[PDB]
């Protein structure tokens, strides 16, 4: 019954893959791997990893001028 204060995420395996390469970029993003859709993300960087992922999908979408 040991409690670790983490943030579980629910997403498709592609977003899970993206945040695991974000973990591969810098150290404290996701703590342990659980499933293909559930990962325990550190709660202190939730808006931070949102700021990386929306930036990553900004190049994925086309913005007309």
Distance CA 58, CA 25 (A): 19
Q: At its nearest, how many Å lie between other proteins and the CB of residue 28?
A: 15
Which CB atom, from 28 or from 50, has the smaller least distance to other proteins? Answer: 50
Q: Catalog residues that contact other proteins under the rule CB under 8 A.
A: 1-19, 21, 32, 34-36, 38, 40-41, 43, 46, 50, 53, 57, 63
Q: At its nearest, how many Å lie between other proteins and the CB of residue 16?
A: 8
Distance CA 39, CA 42 (A): 10
State whether residue 42 is helix, strand or coil: coil
Distance CA 6, CA 37 (A): 15
Which CB atom, from 27 or from 43, has the smaller least distance to other proteins? Answer: 43
């Amino acid at each position: 019954a040991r409690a670790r204060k983490g943030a579980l995420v629910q997403c498709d395996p592609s977003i899970k893959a993206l945040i695991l390469q974000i973990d591969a970029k810098m150290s404290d993003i996701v703590l342990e791997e659980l499933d293909d859709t559930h990962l325990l993300v550190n709660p202190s960087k939730v808006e931070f990893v949102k700021h990386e992922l929306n930036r990553l999908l900004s190049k994925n979408i086309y913005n007309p001028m």
